Write an enzyme that holds these catalytic residues in place. Structure first.
Site, mmCIF file in Angstrom:
data_model
loop_
_atom_site.group_PDB
_atom_site.id
_atom_site.type_symbol
_atom_site.label_atom_id
_atom_site.label_comp_id
_atom_site.label_asym_id
_atom_site.label_seq_id
_atom_site.Cartn_x
_atom_site.Cartn_y
_atom_site.Cartn_z
ATOM 1 N N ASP A 35 6.192 10.655 11.310
ATOM 2 C CA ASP A 35 6.218 9.227 11.610
ATOM 3 C C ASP A 35 5.834 8.420 10.380
ATOM 4 O O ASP A 35 4.647 8.256 10.092
ATOM 5 C CB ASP A 35 5.256 8.940 12.760
ATOM 6 C CG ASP A 35 5.232 7.482 13.164
ATOM 7 O OD1 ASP A 35 6.116 6.732 12.707
ATOM 8 O OD2 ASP A 35 4.330 7.104 13.954
ATOM 9 N N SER A 199 15.759 -5.750 2.991
ATOM 10 C CA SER A 199 17.199 -5.567 2.959
ATOM 11 C C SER A 199 17.862 -6.848 2.471
ATOM 12 O O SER A 199 17.383 -7.950 2.725
ATOM 13 C CB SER A 199 17.692 -5.186 4.353
ATOM 14 O OG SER A 199 19.101 -5.155 4.429
HETATM 15 N N1 LIG Z 1 4.449 5.304 16.140
HETATM 16 C C1 LIG Z 1 4.519 6.076 17.394
HETATM 17 C C2 LIG Z 1 5.922 6.568 17.698
HETATM 18 O O1 LIG Z 1 6.768 5.420 17.694
HETATM 19 C C3 LIG Z 1 5.974 7.313 19.016
HETATM 20 C C4 LIG Z 1 6.313 8.665 19.049
HETATM 21 C C5 LIG Z 1 6.386 9.342 20.250
HETATM 22 C C6 LIG Z 1 6.121 8.693 21.443
HETATM 23 O O2 LIG Z 1 6.164 9.333 22.643
HETATM 24 C C7 LIG Z 1 5.785 7.334 21.423
HETATM 25 O O3 LIG Z 1 5.580 6.712 22.611
HETATM 26 C C8 LIG Z 1 5.709 6.661 20.212
#
Ligand SMILES: NC[C@H](O)c1ccc(O)c(O)c1
Length: 330
Positions: A35, A199
Site C-alpha cells: 500500500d 498530472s
Molecule cells: N489504505 C488502506 C487500503 O485502501 C485498504 C486495503 C484493504 C482493505 O480491506 C481496506 O478496507 C482498505
C-alpha cells in the site's frame, strides 16, 4: 541488494493485489497488500480477536526465534475507506522477494474492522508511503522500504500491476525489460506523507487532451481512480446511460456498454487506461448495472491514482533524497 516479488489480484475484478512476505524465523509467509498510500506493516496474528479472524493466515510471534516485543509500542490506523485496525508491535526479520530487513516493525493486530475480517485473502498490509505517516506510538517506526533503502543497489521500488493478471514489485532496481519507450519522471511532494504528484491533464477516449493540473497520490492500496467531479463527469458523459447513483455510491453504467479509454498526463507523456480497465462489473450479482472504475474524489479531499490508473503503467517510486515518481507505458 535487490528484491523481486510477484503480486497477484485477489479476485476477478482486481480489487486488490497480494504479495507473499516472509516474516520471522523459521519463515511465516503471509500474503500482504502492498500500500503506497500508508506506512504501517501490520498483520493478522495469534493476538487478533478470534471472532475477527476468518480464513486469514496469521503471524505467531511466539513461534519466531527472531521476534522481540517492542515494549510499550502500540498502533492504531484508520484508512480512507473507513476501515481500521490496531494492536501492539514486534520487531522481526522480514523478507520480500529475496530482500531481507532485520529489525522491521511488524504491527500485530489485536483488532481489525469488518472489511478486513470479511476478506480472507489479505493477511495484512505493507505500507510504502513515507514513514512520517507511521502510526506506532510512542516511537514512530520506519517502513520496510525505508529500512531497506541503504542496502539497496538504488533507492527505488517499482510497481508493475497486472490487468486481470499477476504483476511485480521490485526493490532496488529498474527492470528495463518491463516497460516500453521511456520513463517520464515527475516531482513529488512529501508534505502529506504520500507519493503526491501533479498530472498535467487528461483525455476521454479519442478526444482532445485537456491541459490542467491535477494534484493526487499514487496509491497501490486504492482500487479505483478518484478525480475531480468535473473530470469524472466529462468521462461518464461519453457512456450512454451512465449516471451517478447516490444509493450505489458512485457512477454506474449499463453493463452492455463499451467503455472509452481514459488518458492522463505525466509531464509531456501520456498514459492510456483502456476502457476495459474501468469496468468493475455488476453492482450486485446478476445486475445489468455495472460499477465504474473512475469515480469522483469530491468529499475525499484528495485525488487518488489508484490501481485502475497504476496498472496501465510501469511506475517507479524513487526514494532518493529528493523523491520523484516515474511512469512508463508497458
Ligand atoms: N489504505 C488502506 C487500503 O485502501 C485498504 C486495503 C484493504 C482493505 O480491506 C481496506 O478496507 C482498505
Amino acid at each position: 541488494s535487490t528484491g523481486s516479488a510477484t503480486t497477484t489480484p485477489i479476485d476477478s475484478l482486481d480489487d486488490a493485489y497480494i504479495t507473499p512476505v516472509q516474516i520471522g524465523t523459521p519463515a511465516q509467509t503471509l500474503n500482504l497488500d502492498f500500500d503506497t498510500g500508508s506506512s504501517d506493516l501490520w498483520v493478522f496474528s495469534s493476538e487478533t480477536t478470534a471472532s475477527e479472524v476468518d480464513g486469514q493466515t496469521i503471524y505467531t510471534p511466539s513461534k519466531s526465534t527472531t521476534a522481540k516485543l517492542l515494549s510499550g509500542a502500540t498502533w492504531s490506523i484508520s484508512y480512507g475507506d473507513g476501515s481500521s485496525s490496531s494492536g501492539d508491535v514486534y520487531t522481526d526479520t522480514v523478507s520480500v522477494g529475496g530482500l531481507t530487513v532485520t529489525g522491521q516493525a511488524v504491527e500485530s493486530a489485536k483488532k481489525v474492522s469488518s472489511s478486513f475480517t470479511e476478506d480472507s485473502t489479505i493477511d495484512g498490509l505493507l505500507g510504502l508511503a513515507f514513514s512520517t505517516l507511521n502510526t506506532v506510538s510512542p516511537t514512530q517506526q520506519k517502513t520496510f522500504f525505508d529500512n531497506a533503502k541503504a542496502s539497496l543497489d538504488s533507492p527505488v521500488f517499482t510497481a508493475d500491476l497486472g490487468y486481470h493478471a499477476p504483476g511485480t514489485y521490485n526493490f532496488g532496481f529498474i527492470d528495463t525489460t518491463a516497460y516500453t519507450g521511456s520513463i517520464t519522471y515527475t516531482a513529488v511532494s512529501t508534505k502529506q506523507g504520500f507519493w503526491e504528484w501533479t498530472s498535467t491533464g487528461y483525455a476521454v477516449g479519442s478526444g482532445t487532451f485537456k491541459s490542467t493540473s491535477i494534484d493526487g497520490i499514487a496509491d497501490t492500496g486504492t482500487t479505483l481512480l478518484y478525480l475531480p467531479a468535473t473530470v469524472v463527469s466529462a468521462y461518464w458523459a461519453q457512456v450512454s446511460g451512465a449516471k451517478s447513483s447516490s444509493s450505489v455510491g458512485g457512477y454506474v453504467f449499463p453493463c452492455s456498454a463499451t467503455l472509452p479509454s481514459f488518458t492522463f498526463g505525466v509531464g509531456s507523456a501520456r498514459i492510456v487506461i483502456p476502457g476495459d480497465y474501468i469496468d468493475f462489473g455488476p453492482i450486485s450479482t446478476g445486475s445489468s448495472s455495472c460499477f465504474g472504475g473512475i469515480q469522483s474524489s469530491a468529499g475525499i479531499g484528495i485525488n487518488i491514482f489508484g490501481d485502475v490508473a497504476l496498472k496501465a503503467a510501469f511506475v517507479v517510486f524513487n526514494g532518493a533524497t529528493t523523491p520523484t515518481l516515474g511512469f512508463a507505458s508497458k
